[PDB]
Amino acid sequence: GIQVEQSPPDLILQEGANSTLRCNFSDSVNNLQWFHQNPWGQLINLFYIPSGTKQNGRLSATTVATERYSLLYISSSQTTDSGVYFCAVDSATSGTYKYIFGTGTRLKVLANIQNPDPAVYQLRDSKSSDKSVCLFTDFDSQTNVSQSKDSDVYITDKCVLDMRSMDFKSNSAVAWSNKSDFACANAFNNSIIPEDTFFPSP
Amino acid sequence: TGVSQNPRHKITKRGQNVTFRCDPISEHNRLYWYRQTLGQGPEFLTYFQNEAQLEKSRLLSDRFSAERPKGSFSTLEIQRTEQGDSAMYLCASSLGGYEQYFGPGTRLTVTEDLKNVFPPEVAVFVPSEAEISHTQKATLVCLATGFYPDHVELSWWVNGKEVHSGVCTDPQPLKEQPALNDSRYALSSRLRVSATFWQDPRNHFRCQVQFYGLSENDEWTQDRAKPVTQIVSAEAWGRAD
C-alpha cells in the first residue's frame, strides 16, 4: 500500500552548490529515515525524521507530515557527498515498522578544478618494460570518459584525488590492454576530450 | 552504530546453505533484516519483536530461515543458494520500534563453482617522465586484475604508513568479460605525489589489495593454490632516473 517517490532521480552539482532532495510518500507514517549509500555501496543513516526539522552540519532536513513529504537539504556540497540518497518510510497500518525504501537520488558532485591541464601519459610497470597503462589526467570534472568498443581494451571511470597540502585536486582515468598493438594516442578515442589535450611525443 | 554483523564477506558455491549473524545494540527489542542487490534500495526480509518473527516478505521462500533464539543475536540462513542471492544483507535494530540502526552488512557472492575464485594480480606503474616535466607531479597507478569475487580493499602505503591524501580508487571494479558468467574483475587506483618526492630514492610506495576469498573449512580439490583470503601487494622505490 505505502509508496515512496524520490526526486530528482539524478542530481549533478558543482562543488559548493546547494541542493534540495525530496521524498514524497502516500500515507501517514510512523518512521522516516534518510540514508547515504556511498559509491562503495555502504548505507549510512543521516536523519530519523517522521516530523519536524533536524540539523547536522552541512545537512539538514524537514518533514511536513500533513503534506506527506520530506526534504533533505545539502549545503556547500563536497565531492564526498557523491552517492545515492535514500528515503525510507514505514506504514501506519501494520505495527511491524518495516521500512520501504525509495529508488533513490543519485548525486554526483563535480570537483572544482582551478586550472585543468588535460593530458594523456604512458606509464610503465615497475617490474617489466613490457607492460604499460595510459593515464588520462588533469581534465575538468565535466569531462566524460567512455568505455572502449574494443573488448581487449579496459577503461576505468573517472575519479578525483585531493592533494590536501597543495590545495590541489585532479581527475583521472586509466586505460590498459593485453594487446602489443595498444597505443595511448588511440586509447581514449571513444571519449570526447578537449581539443587542447596534451599528448607528449616520448 | 553498535550493530555488528559477521561475516563481512562470504563466498559460496550455489546449492549450499550459508548462515549470517547479527548482534544488535544491547537492549534493543526489535531486529530487522534487509537485502540490497546491485544498484538498488534495500528490500525488507524479516522482523523480530523479541524472539518472535512477526513479519516476513512474501516475495521470499521457505529456503530463507531466520532465528533470534534469545531475543538478542539473530541468524539468517539461506538454504539452497542461487546466484540471484548475491547481495548485501543488512541487519538493523531499534530500541522499541522507532529509529533503526544499521549494521555494516554481510556481502554475499554465490558462485557457480569455487574453481571460479581467484585472487588479484597486482602491479604498480611508475610515473611518466612527461608528466613530471609538464606538471611537477608524479602519479603512480596500481592495477589489480583477474580477481573473483569482487571482494577487495585497496590501500596505499608510503614509507610504511597508510596514506589518503593524493589517492583515489575506482568506486567499483570493472568486469573483464562482461558477457561471461562469474567474470573476473579489475580495479585501478592512483597515488599522486610531488615530482621531488617521487625522484628521491629513499621513498617507498606500496599498493596493497586485501582479497576476501575461501575460508579454512572450505573444500578445495583443484590443482592450483587454494584462493584463500589474503593480501597481494606491488611496490616501487623512488628514483631520479
Residue numbers in the entry:
A (entry chain A): 2 to 203
B (entry chain B): 3 to 243
What did the publication describing this PDB structure actually write?
The T cell receptor is a transmembrane protein with an extracellular antigen-binding domain, consisting of an α- and a β-chain, each comprising one variable (TRAV and TRBV) and one constant (TRAC and TRBC) domain. Superantigens are immune stimulatory toxins that bind directly to TCR and MHC as unprocessed proteins, and hence prevent the TCR from recognizing the peptide presented by MHC. Staphylococcal enterotoxin E belongs to group III, which generally has one binding site to TCR, to the TRBV domain, and two distinct binding sites to MHC class II. Here, we present the structures of a T cell receptor, both by itself and in complex with staphylococcal enterotoxin E. The SEE-TCR structure describes the very first interface between a group III superantigen and its TCR.
The crystal structure of extracellular domains of a human chimeric TCR was determined to 1.35 Å resolution. The TCR was crystallized in space group P21 with one molecule in the asymmetric unit. The variable domains TRAV22 and TRBV7-9 were isolated from two TCRs specific against HLA-A2 in complex either with a telomerase peptide (sequence ILAKFLHWL) or a survivin peptide (sequence ELTLGEFLKL), respectively. The TCR exhibited the conventional TCR fold described previously. Briefly, the TCR is a heterodimeric protein consisting of an α- and a β-chain, each with one membrane-distal variable domain (TRAV and TRBV) and one membrane-proximal constant domain (TRAC and TRBC). All four domains have Ig-like folds, almost exclusively consisting of β-sheets. The variable domains have four loops each, CDR1-3 and HV4, and together this surface is responsible for pMHC recognition. Differences in the overall structure of the unbound and SEE-bound TCR are small, with RMSD for main chain atoms of 1.3 and 0.91 for TCRα and TCRβ, respectively. Moreover, Glu69b adopts a single conformation in the bound TCR structure instead of a dual, as in the unligated TCR, since one of the conformations clashes with Tyr32s in SEE.
